[PDB]
């Protein structure tokens, strides 16, 4: 069913969620 | 602490389960690589954090408390339920829970790689660098 992915930014980026599934 | 720097760039939700990439760059030939990858849930956490309390030798140091258990019931709650008003609002509160659970969970094992005694565990080079689950091993 439902997954949520989060990669962190760090220094440079920003943070970001994504829904998969 | 410049020898052993781990962090946690990226997690996923899935269910009621977390996992984690708990990601470790290291110039010691205590590890068997400089720079690696595993991947990690909230329990294995507890199971380190537990290990460390218990082994007779380290009585006295100071252990980093272990991560609470992230909590996401709410924002799958809001999820299954689901309108972008909504959709955004949603993202958020995942983002914001993840945020936390990450830094809590990150700063446990950034606490224990400065520790000049507990960042020596043969337990927690096991945590950092096994290339398997670890549920199935305990």
Redesign the interface.
């Known amino acids: 069913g439902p997954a949520v992915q989060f990669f962190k930014g760090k220094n440079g980026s920003a943070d970001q969620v994504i829904l998969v599934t | 602490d410049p020898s052993l720097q781990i ?9 009621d389960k977390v996992k984690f990439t708990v990601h470790t760059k290291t110039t010691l030939s205590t590890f068997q690589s400089p720079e690696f990858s595993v991947t990690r849930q909230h329990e294995d956490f507890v199971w380190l954090h537990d290990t460390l309390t218990e082994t007779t030798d380290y009585a006295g140091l100071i252990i980093p408390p272990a991560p609470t258990k992230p909590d ?1 019931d709410g ?2 709650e809001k ?2 339920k689901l309108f972008a008003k909504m959709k955004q609002e949603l ?1 958020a509160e ?2 914001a829970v ?2 936390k659970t ?1 830094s809590t969970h990150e700063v446990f094992l950034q606490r224990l790689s400065s520790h000049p005694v507990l960042s020596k565990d043969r337990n927690f080079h096991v945590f950092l660098e096994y290339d398997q689950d670890l549920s199935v091993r305990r």
């Open positions: 962090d946690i760039p990226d997690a996923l939700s899935e269910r996401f924002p799958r999820m299954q993202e995942y983002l993840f945020k990450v």
